[PDB]
Amino acid sequence: SQLSFTATPGSNPNVVTLKNTSSLKVTWDLGNGVTAKGEEVVASYPFANTYTIAMTAYSTTITQTITIANNDESQIEPKAIILAGGLTGSKTWVFDRAHDGHFGVGPGAGNPDYNGTPSWWSCPAEGKAECALYENEFSFHLDGGYNMTWVNKGKIYTNGAGKDKLPGVATVPGAGDFDVEYIPKEAYTFTVDGDKLKLSDDAFFGHFAGTSTYTIKTLNENELYLECSSAVESGNGWWYRFVPKK
Missing domain, CATH: 2.60.40 (Immunoglobulin-like)
Structure with missing residues (x-):
């Protein structure tokens, strides 16, 4: 009283x-x-x-x-606002399957041969249609924090080194390497700190390489371009290009 x-x-x-x-x-x-x-x-x-x-x-x-009542832009990572498509609502990103170079492998950033590109193999348009890769969709939303929603049709895409670190059943689809059964959690968070994008709860962008850390190379309203350093194949780097759904 x-x-x-x-x-x-x-x-x-x-x-x-x-x-x-x-x-x-x-x-x-x-x-x-x-x-x-x-x-x-x-x-x-x-x-x-x-x-x-x-x-x-x-x-x-x-x-x-x-x-x-409302998110304060002055206190929120600028890159998080681009990922979510704004302070309110949600924005879903999908592999840029309709263009060359949306998925690729090359010397990674700690490799003496690093040239900043997937110089070993760059996926042509639609090259990974016949596997689980493109079924993995990522939505960002600032509804109470730096929130992410990961949707798939129950599988992720990976190679031999990756499937050996995951418990789910592995299948070989038309595109080769492995679909692995892998059901996302219902809710994730993320952090952006400079060009470093980290997913919570061991999440990854549909392709498994044993890491949840990405380097943002390009981010605008039309494009998210990512590098990844493989934790399962020393010195292998992966590249991914995402664009907005629809």
Whole structure:
């Protein structure tokens, strides 16, 4: 009955001022992974969501929930906004199957022979139609965080070195190498840090090479061009080109 605080959204409503207003002469859980200590502290929430704020007088903790209405572009990775197609909604990316060079292998970035291209083999248009590769679709959405949805028809594409690290049944499709049964989790996250794109929960872009780390070579509203360093074949690099679905 003595403890109270105000949670006051600022001119930027994603930045909220927490003020102890208690009838006494104070620490904080801001509900975003940040804690603070002081009579008056500021909380920043990049992502629209509901959060719980806890004020602990030191120890009788009191709480409030707050609703942040909209994503704050000023606090969100620019590349994440391109991947999601905006601050709201979702954007699905698919292999650029209709053009040459959408999938390829060459000396990777730690290889002395690295030339920045898939110089060993570059997939011509439709070259991997007869396998599970193109069935793998990736949607990005900023609905509470850096969120990804991975859809497939129950298989991924890989080679011998890759299939040896996966538990699912392997089949040899028309395109050769291996489809492996591999069902994505229902929800993933990702991080972008400079040109480094990391997927959560050991995810990969439909082709398995034992890594969840990608180097973004090109990213705009029409194109995502990725390098990958194989963790299953030392010094092999992979290239992938994704374009928006439909």
